Point group: C3
Chain length 264, copies 3
């Protein structure tokens, strides 16, 4: 025959523990995500894996904020960069042989360094001509690799590949996104946005049968976007909250006993 | 004539309560956002509502990782998928009749299933020919609907519509984004990125007046992106924190009284 | 010769304080991001700084959800909006003079107001012709500016510039993103996604030498995306957690003493 507020206190404690456990579980289920920007003065030389079927690389150069007009739009020019060639097997199906021409991408961003590439496909029956390209983080990391074919088979799964069509000048603005996985993977990936500009075919009609591919690679900005996942569920903070609530309840019970022995 | 640290304690309590209320209010005002990825082996067959004005669907097929070259670039071919037709009214303005050709999109993603569509518009006065397309989540959810016109009028507001031009082969990479609203709406939407590739018109000059539209639909990856809003303002955690601070202040006051009766 | 649980209590307190400091440091290092959407019935009129090299603005009009077919595809039409001209210097290199044609952007989104622009470049040696465009928030904020050249030089750094090619009708869907920086900068920026549609050159072959640029500007939706960074590290919450945990440890020690004087 007392106040019996201990029952209400126990109910409050049970409810608070239950809601705290539910909150911790739902916070552990749904991590939040954070984005930051790391400014880099000079990117590492990216690798550009082009896939020309039969078109030959007429020209390739390292340009700057402007490209001078082509002296010969559709004739063999000058290749003026470090390019390699690799042959590997497509991870999707082991019955196809893929030949990749690897180009060292532009490093300088403050100066807006460009990689300008021009291919010509002489004759083909394909209705929609297009050259595929893949981007990987470092060309140097590709050079000193024991298994170049294995490197490219890994890059096929690690990165997504796009394509640029003939009759255009595809201007590819590429940027780096580093996703720091919960396992500390630090997976680096490429994002890119294009702008296709028509090619004014001024060549004589005799040579108009051949198709011309122009593509320009640069970095859109000297910022690498780092994306991380943050776990908002901290067990120790939960323990501290539970301890504080339990202490508050215990002191409330003590004050209730004091009130009972004073007035009630 | 005592220490009168109770006044400082009350000031600290008032400041802590004020800052806690402000922090809770600003956390309730700005929910955080979380992104997760759900891997699906086979997407549900999406619905592609195309809006051909007068162009007739020459061909449509379910292809795989490659498209064989067209046997007849601009002549009636074979339609080899499930297509329906609906007529409804534009939700914005009730004075226009919209006729939509609904195509069952590709399901398989591991096999890189394609939907290839080819239209031909014979003659028109339009300077810039383009066919509009809208994407909705399920074609099956469209088949068994009591009000197909109502379904399309809802799809107009629920989804965004794009267009693909003639003289190109628009390759649409489409992915699904499920935004879980605070009201548990779980609104599903489509994102898409294209790649226009020129069409090498090898048809005779007599038939070059007619315009050809080509479009390819697939899924870019087998990942549905779920975006959720997390409320970082928890009333019960706030109550526990306030209780802990109040208890700390009370025990500090008790120890101050002990110090007064000991030395001070 | 006692229980000496005080040593374990001190170790627990040290570990708890250490992990709390580490958690606070890593939370202060990595702020989370919050995204919100503010609906505006009528955007403030944006400023479109176009950079025509030698092409003259044939036509420019404020249209609505449809554009009627051009009465004269490549002849001087009617300019029917507020346009200004400014001359300034490129912030990157002070040796180039940039002439900008500032155009009054579309305000209404409910009515889907369009800005339709048509330029004609008579003769040039450029292989890939394109007109550059920059978007800034307010044209009115540009009109009453003491230093228009300084305003444009600041807009060059504050905003990113794109380009639209000839032989196309680029439809630019633009939207506003306000990033609220930690310093309360409230930096406003423009995002845009395009859709190039081929231009069917029906003009006589005599006038086909000149290149035509068409572009359409509207707002994709009446939503401004506000992106904020939230600091999850609250010093006062950490103080409350530490105080509650310290009190829990103190009461545990008191109960241990009670147990010692009772049984142990």
């Amino acid at each position: 025959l007392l106040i019996f507020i201990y029952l209400l206190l126990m109910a409050v404690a049970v409810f608070l523990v239950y809601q705290t456990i539910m909150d911790f579980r739902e916070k552990l289920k749904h991590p939040v995500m954070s984005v930051s920007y790391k400014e880099v003065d000079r990117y590492d030389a990216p690798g550009i894996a082009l896939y020309p079927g039969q078109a030959q690389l007429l020209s390739c150069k390292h340009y700057y904020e402007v490209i001078p007009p082509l002296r010969s739009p559709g004739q063999p020019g000058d290749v003026n960069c470090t390019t390699q060639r690799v042959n590997y097997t497509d991870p999707f199906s082991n019955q196809t042989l893929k030949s990749a021409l690897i180009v060292r991408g532009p490093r300088e961003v403050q100066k807006r360094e460009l990689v300008f590439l021009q291919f010509r496909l002489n004759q083909s029956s394909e209705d929609f001509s297009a050259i595929d390209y893949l981007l990987f983080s470092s060309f140097q990391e590709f050079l000193q690799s024991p298994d170049r074919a294995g490197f490219m088979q890994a890059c096929e799964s690690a990165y997504s590949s796009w394509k640029f069509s003939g009759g255009f000048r595809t201007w590819v603005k590429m940027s780096l996104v580093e996703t720091k996985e919960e396992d500390g993977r630090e997976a680096v990936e490429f994002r890119q946005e294009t702008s296709v500009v028509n090619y004014i075919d001024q060549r004589p009609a005799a040579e108009k049968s051949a198709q011309l591919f122009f593509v320009v690679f640069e970095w859109k900005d000297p910022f690498i976007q780092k994306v991380q996942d943050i776990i908002t569920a901290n067990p120790w903070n939960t323990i501290a909250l539970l301890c504080g609530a339990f202490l508050a309840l215990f002191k409330a019970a003590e004050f209730a006993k004091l009130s009972v022995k004073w007035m009630a």
